[PDB]
Amino acid sequence: ANWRERSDLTVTVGIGNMNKDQQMLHLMRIWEMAQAVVGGGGLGVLVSEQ
Amino acid sequence: ANWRERSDLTVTVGIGNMNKDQQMLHLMRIWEMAQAVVGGGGLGVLVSEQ
């Protein structure tokens, strides 16, 4: 079809944090609290490997 | 054949981080998180030795 719809909220003011900000968020936040949760109680009950 | 196609994105502004950025990312991002995976899950829990 024509699909009649596009989203560009990954580029600019539409929040779209650029590659630098994306790397910043990933490294300091996502992986770090993932490690904290995993080392907290375990893996299976806590954050899944999936 | 002629192959009618080229691509050299690994050089410049198109993110293509130079050898410095790539080697530092491997030094303290790729190995650090890979070793965290090995310690937590192991070689075979996530992607294997390949």
Tab-separated table of C-alpha atoms in Angstrom:
chain	number	residue	atom	x	y	z
A	1	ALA	CA	0.000	0.000	0.000
A	2	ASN	CA	1.093	3.620	0.474
A	3	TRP	CA	1.004	3.166	4.282
A	4	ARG	CA	-0.015	6.820	4.620
A	5	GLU	CA	1.980	7.335	7.824
A	6	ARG	CA	5.531	8.006	9.005
A	7	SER	CA	7.120	8.897	12.335
A	8	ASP	CA	10.377	10.839	12.654
A	9	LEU	CA	10.570	11.172	16.442
A	10	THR	CA	14.110	9.714	16.403
A	11	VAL	CA	15.813	12.670	14.680
A	12	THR	CA	15.173	16.060	16.219
A	13	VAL	CA	13.075	18.116	18.687
A	14	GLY	CA	10.495	15.353	18.471
A	15	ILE	CA	12.338	13.882	21.297
A	16	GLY	CA	14.678	11.971	18.992
A	17	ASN	CA	17.812	11.939	21.117
A	18	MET	CA	20.680	11.718	18.652
A	19	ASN	CA	23.361	9.035	18.530
A	20	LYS	CA	25.409	10.734	21.252
A	21	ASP	CA	22.475	11.032	23.663
A	22	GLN	CA	21.283	7.537	22.755
A	23	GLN	CA	24.697	6.087	23.612
A	24	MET	CA	24.747	8.123	26.820
A	25	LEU	CA	21.355	6.862	27.966
A	26	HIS	CA	22.081	3.257	26.997
A	27	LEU	CA	25.489	3.041	28.665
A	28	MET	CA	24.831	4.815	31.951
A	29	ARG	CA	21.184	3.862	32.515
A	30	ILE	CA	19.944	0.775	30.707
A	31	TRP	CA	22.897	-1.593	31.009
A	32	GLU	CA	23.776	-0.352	34.492
A	33	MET	CA	20.394	-0.931	36.108
A	34	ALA	CA	20.149	-4.162	34.108
A	35	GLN	CA	23.372	-5.298	35.790
A	36	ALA	CA	22.143	-4.045	39.171
A	37	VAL	CA	18.864	-5.965	38.861
A	38	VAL	CA	20.588	-9.122	37.596
A	39	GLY	CA	23.134	-9.071	40.409
A	40	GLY	CA	20.438	-8.188	42.929
A	41	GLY	CA	18.553	-11.464	43.160
A	42	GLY	CA	19.303	-13.443	40.022
A	43	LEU	CA	18.287	-13.734	36.380
A	44	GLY	CA	15.231	-15.945	35.889
A	45	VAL	CA	12.814	-14.265	38.294
A	46	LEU	CA	14.390	-10.872	37.566
A	47	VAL	CA	15.097	-9.370	34.115
A	48	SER	CA	14.810	-12.075	31.464
A	49	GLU	CA	17.632	-12.952	29.088
A	50	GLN	CA	15.245	-12.372	26.171
B	1	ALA	CA	30.766	-8.183	-13.082
B	2	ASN	CA	30.420	-4.396	-12.691
B	3	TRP	CA	28.416	-4.521	-9.423
B	4	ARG	CA	27.047	-0.998	-10.008
B	5	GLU	CA	27.178	-0.227	-6.271
B	6	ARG	CA	29.551	1.139	-3.629
B	7	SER	CA	29.446	2.016	0.068
B	8	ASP	CA	32.142	3.460	2.345
B	9	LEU	CA	30.216	4.620	5.419
B	10	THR	CA	32.968	3.551	7.864
B	11	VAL	CA	35.142	6.634	7.285
B	12	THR	CA	33.490	9.891	8.340
B	13	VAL	CA	30.438	11.914	9.458
B	14	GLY	CA	28.254	9.000	8.439
B	15	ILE	CA	28.881	7.686	11.845
B	16	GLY	CA	31.726	5.462	10.659
B	17	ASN	CA	33.800	5.929	13.791
B	18	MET	CA	37.536	5.917	13.110
B	19	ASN	CA	39.849	3.210	14.435
B	20	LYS	CA	40.261	5.130	17.707
B	21	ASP	CA	36.576	5.131	18.643
B	22	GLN	CA	36.076	1.548	17.468
B	23	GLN	CA	39.094	0.251	19.373
B	24	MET	CA	38.149	2.069	22.582
B	25	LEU	CA	34.556	0.823	22.311
B	26	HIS	CA	35.889	-2.708	21.974
B	27	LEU	CA	38.349	-2.071	24.812
B	28	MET	CA	35.867	-0.988	27.477
B	29	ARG	CA	32.378	-1.613	26.050
B	30	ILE	CA	32.404	-4.810	23.991
B	31	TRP	CA	34.772	-6.828	26.193
B	32	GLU	CA	33.468	-5.365	29.452
B	33	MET	CA	29.865	-6.338	28.745
B	34	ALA	CA	30.910	-9.622	27.107
B	35	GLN	CA	32.835	-10.564	30.256
B	36	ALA	CA	29.872	-9.479	32.377
B	37	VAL	CA	27.742	-11.845	30.285
B	38	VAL	CA	30.285	-14.643	30.741
B	39	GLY	CA	30.401	-14.126	34.500
B	40	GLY	CA	26.637	-13.864	34.889
B	41	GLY	CA	25.217	-16.286	32.347
B	42	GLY	CA	28.232	-17.872	30.683
B	43	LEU	CA	29.627	-18.596	27.251
B	44	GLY	CA	26.526	-20.438	26.049
B	45	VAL	CA	23.705	-18.564	27.788
B	46	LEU	CA	24.059	-15.653	25.382
B	47	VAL	CA	25.821	-15.883	22.006
B	48	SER	CA	28.503	-18.568	21.965
B	49	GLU	CA	32.230	-18.291	21.253
B	50	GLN	CA	31.692	-17.759	17.506
